[PDB]
Amino acid sequence: TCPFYKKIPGTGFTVDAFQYGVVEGCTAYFLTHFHSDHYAGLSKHFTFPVYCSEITGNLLKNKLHVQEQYIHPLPLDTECIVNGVKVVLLDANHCPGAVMILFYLPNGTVILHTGDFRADPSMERSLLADQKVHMLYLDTTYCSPEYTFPSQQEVIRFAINTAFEAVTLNPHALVVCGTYSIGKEKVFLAIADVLGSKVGMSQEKYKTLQCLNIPEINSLITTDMCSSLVHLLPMMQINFKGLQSHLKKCGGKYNQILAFRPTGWTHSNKFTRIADVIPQTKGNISIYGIPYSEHSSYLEMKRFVQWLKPQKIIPTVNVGTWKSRSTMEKYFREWKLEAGY
Numbered sequence: 001t002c003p004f005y006k007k008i009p010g011t012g013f014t015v016d017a018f019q020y021g022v023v024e025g026c027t028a029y030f031l032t033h034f035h036s037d038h039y040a041g042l043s044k045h046f047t048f049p050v051y052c053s054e055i056t057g058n059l060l061k062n063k064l065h066v067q068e069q070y071i072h073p074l075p076l077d078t079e080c081i082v083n084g085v086k087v088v089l090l091d092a093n094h095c096p097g098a099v100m101i102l103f104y105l106p107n108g109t110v111i112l113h114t115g116d117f118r119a120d121p122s123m124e125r126s127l128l129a130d131q132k133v134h135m136l137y138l139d140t141t142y143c144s145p146e147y148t149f150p151s152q153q154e155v156i157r158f159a160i161n162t163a164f165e166a167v168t169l170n171p172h173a174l175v176v177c178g179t180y181s182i183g184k185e186k187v188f189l190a191i192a193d194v195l196g197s198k199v200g201m202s203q204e205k206y207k208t209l210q211c212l213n214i215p216e217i218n219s220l221i222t223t224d225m226c227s228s229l230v231h232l233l234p235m236m237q238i239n240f241k242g243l244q245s246h247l248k249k250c251g252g253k254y255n256q257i258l259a260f261r262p263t264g265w266t267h268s269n270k271f272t273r274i275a276d277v278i279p280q281t282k283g284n285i286s287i288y289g290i291p292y293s294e295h296s297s298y299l300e301m302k303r304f305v306q307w308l309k310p311q312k313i314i315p316t317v318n319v320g321t322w323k324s325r326s327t328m329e330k331y332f333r334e335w336k337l338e339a340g341y
């Protein structure tokens, strides 16, 4: 059944709750972003109102074929009324079109639902600064102190410098980047930019990227693989067997692959710096795992919460085990006692 952390009390609303059939008493289904664990269940047969960003609405229409009459896009940073209740959508710093949602309940309670987010100090100057938030539905994906990772900027600098060096040493090297969802587009776009190439990809992935309102996108991507020296492939294919295979397909245009796997966290983060990362190599193929995250580090999460000072926190990630739930509740209490709220 629909879990309680997907329901917004005092409303008929649910958030990211599309896989339970008809939720009894739901008058509006919000969708925070277009990732499969969140939209799971939506299709062309859905006949209830869906409230989302413009970009998520483009993806619902074009990729899932949800009918236009049930898609309700809202602008960001704008007070809107939905079934009698004031809401605001805020940028979540996750993947394209990802939002946080502020609900202003008729009784005076204010609720923030983060969806998936990567907390940033810039959020402390949004419409969130303007009133008190009583209840926080929090993306707790990396809520443990071992989870450190570098900034997105540091990671992109590493990838750009690595690729440019390799291709300038060997003009017959191919760059490949893995993907299995939207998000992390900066990785392959920044590398293609430094190399003066467009990124080549499948027709399905090109269609997905054409929904994202990225400026000048027609200048940056293509379905012509032969004219491109940065290829995107399914993340599943980013291994030695899959890459040797791909290289055979390029018809002796290339003699070397340099591949990037943008992982979330991996335990080499507890020891190794970004300057010190090394690839796995077999023959003329090298694979780099780079820690490009679109979720909060533990310290970024802690700073956000200690700034916001919520009265109650409801985790939305890692909720399935008693040990995880108890560990998270311990951190929340530490944070509250340290900051004095």
Ligand code: NI
Binding pocket: 033, 035, 094, 116
């Ligand atoms: Ni997500």
